[PDB]
């Protein structure tokens, strides 16, 4: 036999998918039929199929041409959101294994709230305070670090909670952020979007707080 262990397992899964269509049955999820073998290998492959499923799990127009779906601005927009949701969740798992030694170890004690996780993530990745931070701290951590890694993990709510406890320090950023969390597609209104960009460009193009720049 010329098929390696992995290849053979895939063949069997493709036989099922064929047996289903040959007997007229329900068209099963191919992506699921392939990830079934991935778990038998290292996670290098499992995390791939996870990306494949999430990048292909977009509302499509059945019985429509391939080129048309991929040219439509409608579909092209959802791809960006599905990827961002993968990069955010993927990073969220990196933040767990960074605090706890094993995913299992984190689970038994219970996944903490994205806020407390991020806080327990800042402890490690910045043990000493950087002298260039701005806008003070919040419960022992720089306010901008919390906002960034919360947005990076994809929990805008956890980030907005941080903002609510620093209303006086952050200035007008509150009304701007609260609009970003509300507006869909992660975009602000052109008027308000113009107000903040010009302010940042005005005197904050080079600020000593990198987290502030990023957000």
């Amino acid at each position: 036999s010329s098929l390696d262990n992995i290849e053979m397992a895939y063949a069997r899964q493709i036989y099922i998918y064929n047996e289903k269509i040959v007997n007229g049955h329900l068209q099963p999820n191919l992506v699921d039929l392939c990830a079934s073998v991935a778990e038998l290998d290292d996670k290098s492959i499992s995390d791939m199929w996870t990306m494949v499923k999430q990048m292909t799990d977009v509302l499509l127009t059945p019985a429509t041409d391939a080129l048309k779906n991929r040219s439509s601005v409608e579909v092209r927009m959802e791809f960006v959101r599905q990827a961002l949701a993968y990069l955010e969740q993927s990073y969220k798992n990196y933040t767990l294994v960074t605090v706890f030694g094993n995913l299992h170890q984190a689970q038994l004690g219970g996944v903490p709230g994205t806020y407390q996780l991020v806080r327990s993530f800042l402890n490690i990745k910045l043990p000493a305070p950087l002298p260039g931070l701005q806008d003070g701290e919040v419960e022992g951590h720089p306010v901008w670090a919390l906002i960034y890694y919360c947005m990076r993990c994809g929990d805008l709510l956890a980030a907005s909670q941080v903002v609510n406890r620093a209303q006086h320090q952050l200035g007008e950023f509150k009304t701007w952020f609260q609009e970003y969390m509300n507006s869909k597609d992660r975009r602000l209104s052109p008027a308000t979007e113009n107000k903040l960009r010009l302010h940042y460009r005005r005197a904050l193009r080079n600020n000593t707080d990198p987290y502030k720049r990023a957000v």
Partner: protein
């Protein structure tokens, strides 16, 4: 004059007054002489001022056992600030004050006496920083997970002993070695508590201990993440890197605690490699 030069009375022109006070401390401080030597009035003045800054501390017990501190923290801060401003004053005038710079037997013992006082000042500041660090944690928690002899030694530890006697230094080295252990259980931040102990109370902390603390950090946090599969092989592998660096300086008590944890995490082959490495670095010449 020394006190005014250090800003005392200024809680009430002021630069010129402090500069005049400096001039009086230098010009009229006298000099050392053979009578066994008689040190200068400048030396006795420095000893008198320093003593009065710490008179409420010296003979007092550090702690009161629910353990707490004998001296309020706010008082320890002001005392430390006063000691540091005195030190800052001596450094900024190391070239103009007689006896600070190195220089016949009279001026010799004058230099030695002044040097000893300055070493006590930095030791006082380190000692105070250590006590403040201690009570920032949860001492009662640390005090519970402690042996009786060390509880008793801490019970009757005075500030004098902490500042000027080896047992205070040895006990201080035990407490720091214990607080970090506890800090890892809380697990807020290891590398911040590191840089805290590394610099301020240096000469009492050891850089080979913080790297060890960094190793025991990943070890305990590898036991925290123990349920996860792919996160440990980075924690345990990096803990192993940290241990092998301080191999020529690991205590048998730590090396054991490391191997004990490695076995819990089925990290057999790795733990063997650490012990073998610690061996070679204790005896390189074979």
């Amino acid at each position: 004059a020394l006190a005014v030069a250090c800003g005392q009375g200024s809680d009430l022109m002021d630069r010129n007054t402090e500069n005049l006070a400096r001039a009086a401390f230098i010009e009229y401080g006298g000099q050392p002489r053979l009578a066994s030597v008689r040190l200068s009035s400048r030396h006795d003045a420095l000893a008198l001022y320093l003593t009065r800054l710490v008179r409420t501390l010296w003979k007092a017990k550090v702690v009161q056992v629910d353990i707490s501190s004998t001296i309020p923290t706010s008082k320890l801060v002001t005392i430390q600030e006063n000691v540091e401003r005195l030190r800052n004053f001596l450094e900024a005038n190391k070239s103009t004050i007689q006896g600070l710079a190195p220089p016949d037997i009279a001026n010799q013992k004058e230099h030695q006496a002044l040097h000893a006082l300055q070493k006590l000042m930095e030791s006082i500041s380190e000692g105070i920083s250590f006590v403040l660090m201690l009570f920032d944690e949860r001492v009662s928690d640390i005090y519970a997970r402690l042996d009786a002899v060390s509880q008793q030694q801490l019970k009757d530890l005075t500030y004098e002993q902490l500042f000027s006697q080896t047992p205070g230094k040895e006990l201080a080295k035990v407490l720091v070695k214990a607080i970090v252990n506890r800090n890892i259980a809380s697990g807020a931040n290891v590398e911040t508590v590191a840089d805290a102990l590394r610099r301020r109370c240096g000469s009492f902390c050891s850089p080979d201990d913080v790297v060890t603390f960094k190793a025991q950090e990943q070890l305990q946090r590898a036991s925290e993440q123990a349920h996860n599969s792919p996160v440990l092989r980075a924690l345990l592998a990096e803990s192993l890197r940290l241990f092998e660096q301080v191999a020529g300086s690991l205590t048998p008590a730590n090396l054991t605690t490391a191997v004990e944890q490695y076995i819990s995490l089925k990290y057999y082959a790795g733990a063997i490699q650490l012990c073998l490495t610690v061996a070679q670095q204790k005896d390189r010449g074979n």
